[PDB]
Design a protein around this ligand. Sequence first.
Ligand SMILES: Nc1cc(NC(=O)NC2CC2)ccc1C(=O)N[C@@H]1c2cccc(O)c2C[C@@H]1C(=O)O
Length: 167
Amino acid sequence: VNSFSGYLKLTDNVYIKNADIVEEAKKVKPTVVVNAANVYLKHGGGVAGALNKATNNAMQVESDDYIATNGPLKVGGSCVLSGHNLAKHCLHVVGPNVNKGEDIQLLKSAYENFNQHEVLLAPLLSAGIFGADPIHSLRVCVDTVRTNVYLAVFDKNLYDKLVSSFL
Ligand SMILES: Nc1cc(NC(=O)NC2CC2)ccc1C(=O)N[C@@H]1c2cccc(O)c2C[C@@H]1C(=O)O
């Protein structure tokens, strides 16, 4: 038993809810919140800019030190950093950005990072300003992640379409 509330159960291990992932993180304080990161950990917009804003830019300060030491991530890759005031840890995961021409097959590799954590609060990878089809992203999530994932979908219209179209 965990503290996530109001989710619809899609499979044995995947749950979904129309929710603002920022508000959901502040309320649950999960062990892991997933960020929709880019390879430079430049948290400008979408899910990343919102999570970073909620940390009063501390996420960006930590991220800049990470990149100065380690260099950029790979598309499909991840790193674990602090969750600041939102979670114990933030798993920064880089899904492919269709608006940069990146290979959508990298979406499965991106979701594989979630399997290193028993429970996660997450957005749909590559959705939103990353340009992929969120229905496809949800399908890859369900077919790739084996650990317990609580997906937060900001847009109510999309959530209903995601729910109403799910096989
Ligand atoms: N830019 C944001 C900002 C926040 N939250 C705040 O700003 N919270 C502050 C405290 C009030 C949450 C989500 C977002 C955000 O980009 N969503 C995206 C989106 C939108 C429409 C269609 C989509 O496919 C997607 C994929 C993303 C998602 O929903 O995962």
